[PDB]
Design an enzyme around this catalytic site. Structure first.
Site, PDB file in Angstrom:
ATOM      1  N   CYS A   1       3.609   2.225   9.535  1.00 31.43           N
ATOM      2  CA  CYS A   1       3.493   1.052   8.624  1.00 31.43           C
ATOM      3  C   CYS A   1       4.868   0.602   8.159  1.00 31.43           C
ATOM      4  CB  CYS A   1       2.657   1.375   7.400  1.00 31.43           C
ATOM      5  SG  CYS A   1       0.898   1.373   7.792  1.00 31.43           S
TER       6      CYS A   1
ATOM      7  N   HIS B   1       0.835  -1.235   0.000  1.00 36.43           N
ATOM      8  CA  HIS B   1       0.000   0.000   0.000  1.00 36.43           C
ATOM      9  C   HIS B   1       0.864   1.278   0.000  1.00 36.43           C
ATOM     10  CE1 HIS B   1      -0.103  -0.097   4.617  1.00 36.43           C
ATOM     11  NE2 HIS B   1      -0.061   1.226   4.414  1.00 36.43           N
TER      12      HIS B   1
ATOM     13  N   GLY C   1       2.519   6.707   9.647  1.00 35.22           N
ATOM     14  CA  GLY C   1       3.897   6.469   9.172  1.00 35.22           C
ATOM     15  C   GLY C   1       4.533   5.254   9.825  1.00 35.22           C
TER      16      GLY C   1
HETATM   17  C1  LIG Z   1       0.582   3.078   8.019  1.00 36.84           C
HETATM   18  N1  LIG Z   1       1.434   3.993   7.807  1.00 36.84           N
HETATM   19  C2  LIG Z   1      -0.860   3.235   8.484  1.00 36.84           C
HETATM   20  C3  LIG Z   1      -0.962   2.825   9.958  1.00 36.84           C
HETATM   21  C4  LIG Z   1      -2.151   3.385  10.732  1.00 36.84           C
HETATM   22  C5  LIG Z   1      -2.375   4.887  10.704  1.00 36.84           C
HETATM   23  C6  LIG Z   1      -2.952   5.206  12.079  1.00 36.84           C
HETATM   24  N2  LIG Z   1      -2.536   4.073  12.900  1.00 36.84           N
HETATM   25  C7  LIG Z   1      -2.001   3.088  12.212  1.00 36.84           C
HETATM   26  O1  LIG Z   1      -1.451   2.099  12.690  1.00 36.84           O
HETATM   27  N3  LIG Z   1      -1.747   2.439   7.637  1.00 36.84           N
HETATM   28  C8  LIG Z   1      -2.870   2.937   7.094  1.00 36.84           C
HETATM   29  O2  LIG Z   1      -3.184   4.125   7.180  1.00 36.84           O
HETATM   30  C9  LIG Z   1      -3.818   1.925   6.452  1.00 36.84           C
HETATM   31  C10 LIG Z   1      -3.706   1.891   4.927  1.00 36.84           C
HETATM   32  C11 LIG Z   1      -4.999   2.437   4.357  1.00 36.84           C
HETATM   33  C12 LIG Z   1      -5.930   2.783   5.505  1.00 36.84           C
HETATM   34  N4  LIG Z   1      -5.206   2.333   6.706  1.00 36.84           N
HETATM   35  C13 LIG Z   1      -5.676   2.279   7.967  1.00 36.84           C
HETATM   36  O3  LIG Z   1      -4.985   1.820   8.885  1.00 36.84           O
HETATM   37  C14 LIG Z   1      -7.088   2.804   8.228  1.00 36.84           C
HETATM   38  N5  LIG Z   1      -7.909   1.716   8.737  1.00 36.84           N
HETATM   39  C15 LIG Z   1      -8.625   0.931   7.929  1.00 36.84           C
HETATM   40  O4  LIG Z   1      -8.608   1.008   6.717  1.00 36.84           O
HETATM   41  C16 LIG Z   1      -9.541  -0.113   8.584  1.00 36.84           C
HETATM   42  F1  LIG Z   1     -10.024   0.299   9.751  1.00 36.84           F
HETATM   43  F2  LIG Z   1     -10.584  -0.405   7.816  1.00 36.84           F
HETATM   44  F3  LIG Z   1      -8.905  -1.252   8.812  1.00 36.84           F
HETATM   45  C17 LIG Z   1      -7.116   4.053   9.129  1.00 36.84           C
HETATM   46  C18 LIG Z   1      -8.578   4.434   9.397  1.00 36.84           C
HETATM   47  C19 LIG Z   1      -6.413   5.210   8.407  1.00 36.84           C
HETATM   48  C20 LIG Z   1      -6.414   3.819  10.476  1.00 36.84           C
HETATM   49  C21 LIG Z   1      -4.611   1.002   4.095  1.00 36.84           C
HETATM   50  C22 LIG Z   1      -4.324   0.688   2.641  1.00 36.84           C
HETATM   51  C23 LIG Z   1      -5.350  -0.125   4.789  1.00 36.84           C
END
Ligand SMILES: *C(=N)[C@H](C[C@@H]1CCNC1=O)NC(=O)[C@@H]1[C@@H]2[C@H](CN1C(=O)[C@@H](NC(=O)C(F)(F)F)C(C)(C)C)C2(C)C
Ligand SMILES: *C(=N)[C@H](C[C@@H]1CCNC1=O)NC(=O)[C@@H]1[C@@H]2[C@H](CN1C(=O)[C@@H](NC(=O)C(F)(F)F)C(C)(C)C)C2(C)C
Lengths: 299, 306
Positions: free
Chosen positions: B145, B41, B143
């Site tokens: 991730c 992603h 960030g």
């Molecule tokens: C990586 N950098 C982030 C980690 C997140 C951000 C806040 N806390 C964390 O651990 N990853 C993401 O933003 C991923 C990414 C798109 C959306 N996302 C999410 O984690 C979102 N959650 C979901 O999509 C859910 F709930 F459906 F699982 C968010 C609402 C922004 C926390 C992708 C491609 C999954």
């Protein structure tokens, strides 16, 4: 989001850890530049001043990984022995020795035979002990904070008190608390709760959506500190209330507001509820710890 | 003596962390020999993340669309390939700090250390467990991730987790290092909620054995139980079933304490029935389930305090 008892990355300190042997005694040393620091009790009511001046250099077996370092000098500083070696540690970080106050937190790198085994986060208790996790050969294991790329060493491990809690020195060999490095009868004093840290942790709960414990009421330092010392809490000083400022704005709960919630919790308990998955009031996170984990600061 | 949520020393993972950038997206990657592993992603924009077609997004990318940075050194990407939900970037340099490593898929109940990273810089290290519902209770911001979970066995680093996402309940989801998600989740911002969580029964029993080893017996009773009567009661408190494998895994802690696994099960059963009575065990007022039998044996004497 999320809130965890989080240690500093241990990499820079891992590069400094060596094994020190003097006879049958083995423990851990910290190798910085061309000096190895370790508890002076490695040489063993003893007589250190005398014992060491007697002992020659090739008596200290200093192992760094597979290599052996040759000791070209020794010397005492309070309760720490300094061993001069022929070669500077090339993995030596940017570093200093600091002395921490009670209530301040740090990371312990637990080591055996100069080999890091684990890392955990600690608070210097008001009674100058730490609630550590240490077995035989843990002595010389160190406590540290990291500030940008600078490692501040604040603790070297010496001993375990009968209650199962731990005592050591700063890196200049000065004990934390009223203890001695002798096989004698020693106890921890009665401990208190680090009030400023509980309040910091309640602010972390709020920042993370845990809010059931808030209320309408506010208080004053006096009334709060009268309730505090009843429940074996540290006095909250005016300095503490300043430090919590950041968290008070960032959340919109006022420190004396949060003091009213904590008062209410001391009197009524938790009603089978938790805060950040704890059924106790956690006092091992500083305000600085909370802002740093909830901000994402790196090293 | 003492009992702490201990993490593994992070140094060997620290030397592997890099920053990976694709357009405006930066996350962390893991540099082992001449491959950088990160969440796929990283190639997604704001408009992709609901129904991203990764195969389609990726075919539209050159190696030089990937900026990889190890401290000051920009590394040069010479190859790229998707495996499940991880991107693998082949780079010109093998990491000189690469440890002895392997990749492992872990089962619910298993613990590991997390090195929380931002911009390829480590922020802190903590210990986690794979929850039964395949989530972890991490501490992770924007960030984070690409941050990895790991165990260390002598000198060898087993990578078991890579962070991908945060679910609505504030809990975390990610993949093994082959890019296969733990649990029924997907790298899309679609409606996703964790299964109801359960307590990791074998781990609580391990932690009660830890409590006896450090010399605390106040919660023992003179009863025993059948595994099945125990499980019939435990399910009523949202505890995972205890299996015969779990009972075998507790063999050593049983031998060190002289307390039969099913007698420890009788204690836990009573603790659930009554709570703590304003008492604590190893400093917790709750029953702790994020310590494995292997963890307790590792951290505890080997000689019981009485
Ligand atoms: C990586 N950098 C982030 C980690 C997140 C951000 C806040 N806390 C964390 O651990 N990853 C993401 O933003 C991923 C990414 C798109 C959306 N996302 C999410 O984690 C979102 N959650 C979901 O999509 C859910 F709930 F459906 F699982 C968010 C609402 C922004 C926390 C992708 C491609 C999954
Ligand atoms: C260093 N390798 C050990 C670490 C200890 C062993 C068990 N857990 C620990 O943290 N340090 C020692 O063995 C020190 C050392 C002599 C005795 N000692 C103790 O920790 C002992 N305690 C005390 O002396 C007392 F009571 F004062 F606290 C022991 C009874 C073995 C727990 C010296 C020089 C103090």
């Amino acid at each position: 989001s999320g809130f965890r008892k989080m240690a500093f990355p241990s990499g820079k300190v891992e590069g400094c850890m060596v094994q020190v042997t003097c006879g049958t005694t083995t423990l851990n040393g910290l190798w910085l530049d061309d000096v190895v620091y370790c508890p002076r009790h490695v040489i063993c009511n003893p007589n250190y001043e005398d014992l060491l001046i007697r002992k020659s250099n090739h008596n200290f077996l200093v192992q760094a990984g597979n290599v052996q370092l040759r000791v070209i000098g020794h010397s005492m500083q309070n309760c720490v022995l300094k061993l001069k070696v022929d070669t500077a540690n090339p993995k030596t970080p940017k570093y200093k020795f600091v002395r921490i106050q009670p209530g301040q937190t740090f990371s312990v790198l637990a080591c055996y035979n100069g080999s890091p085994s684990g890392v955990y986060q600690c608070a210097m208790r008001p009674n100058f002990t730490i609630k550590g996790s240490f077995l035989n050969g843990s002595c010389g294991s160190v406590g540290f904070n990291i500030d940008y790329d600078c490692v501040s060493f604040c603790y070297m491990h010496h001993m375990e008190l009968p209650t199962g809690v731990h005592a050591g020195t700063d890196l200049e060999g000065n004990f934390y608390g009223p203890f001695v490095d002798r096989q004698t009868a020693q106890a921890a004093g009665t401990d208190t709760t680090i009030t400023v840290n509980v309040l910091a942790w309640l602010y972390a709960a709020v920042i993370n959506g845990d809010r059931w414990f808030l209320n309408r009421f506010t208080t004053t330092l006096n009334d709060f500190n009268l309730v505090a010392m009843k429940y074996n809490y540290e006095p909250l000083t005016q300095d503490h209330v300043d430090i919590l400022g950041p968290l008070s704005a960032q959340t919109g709960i006022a420190v004396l507001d949060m003091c009213a919630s904590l008062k209410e919790l001391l009197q009524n308990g938790m009603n089978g509820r938790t805060i950040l998955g704890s059924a106790l009031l956690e006092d091992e996170f500083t305000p600085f710890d909370v802002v740093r984990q909830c901000s994402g600061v790196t090293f």
